[PDB]
Design a binder for this molecule. Sequence first.
Ligand SMILES: *[C@@H]1O[C@H](CO)[C@@H](O[C@@H]2O[C@H](CO)[C@@H](O)[C@H](O)[C@H]2NC(C)=O)[C@H](O)[C@H]1NC(C)=O
Lengths: 49, 195
Amino acid sequence: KLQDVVNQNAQALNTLVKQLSSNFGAISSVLNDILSRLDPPEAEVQIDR
Amino acid sequence: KRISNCVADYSVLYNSTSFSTFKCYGVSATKLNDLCFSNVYADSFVVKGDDVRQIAPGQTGVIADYNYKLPDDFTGCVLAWNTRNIDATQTGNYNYKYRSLRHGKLRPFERDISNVPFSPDGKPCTPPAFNCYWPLNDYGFYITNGIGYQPYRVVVLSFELLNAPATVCGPKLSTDLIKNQCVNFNFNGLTGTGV
Ligand SMILES: *[C@@H]1O[C@H](CO)[C@@H](O[C@@H]2O[C@H](CO)[C@@H](O)[C@H](O)[C@H]2NC(C)=O)[C@H](O)[C@H]1NC(C)=O
């Protein structure tokens, strides 16, 4: 019973972190990359997503 | 044309000429100097001024339908300038031709060369019958032509961004390496902050 709460906590945190590296419709999944490749007027379009 | 292992400066090409149609879709035109792209491709052709707009992702037109379909995910710039003075002539320039019709649509970034009369049926046609019509057609190019009918020369630069280590890097100055300090870094386009 003690191990299961730890496992669910760890799985929640790991899923949270894994969700970071994922395009949500954006051209890229790294904020740095989108800024480098796009001017702010069309950068905000991806950053909002 | 594949372009590799060379320092590429956007500024010289931008100061060189006021291009008729200059737009970068997946890239910022100004930020080209900062970033590195691997294996840039250059595609060259000549189309009438009306055709220039058709060169775009997710856009349909006779040239797009049969001649040049850009990828919808295409990342790079398109540069186009007027070329009436050197190409067009009074008698008529018919060297530059286009595939008016074709049995199907070409895939993105593909070249079609077949020179056989087209059939709307798609089955073989005899040239005398109305089924056969020549796909390969040319615009009558004249000096007196309107700017839309006047020839335009278009070069499309496609950059493969971050696929692999980038052989093509813009002109920037490397600096000395600093350790144990939380600093900015740009390793061949890998911009970031850290120690
Ligand atoms: C052909 O290449 C040359 C060199 O890049 C371009 O000529 C330059 O044009 C600018 C402005 O028109 C001048 O300031 C430079 O001095 C020129 N370079 C020279 C004389 O060496 C020319 O624009 C290019 N032709 C094109 C792009 O059609």
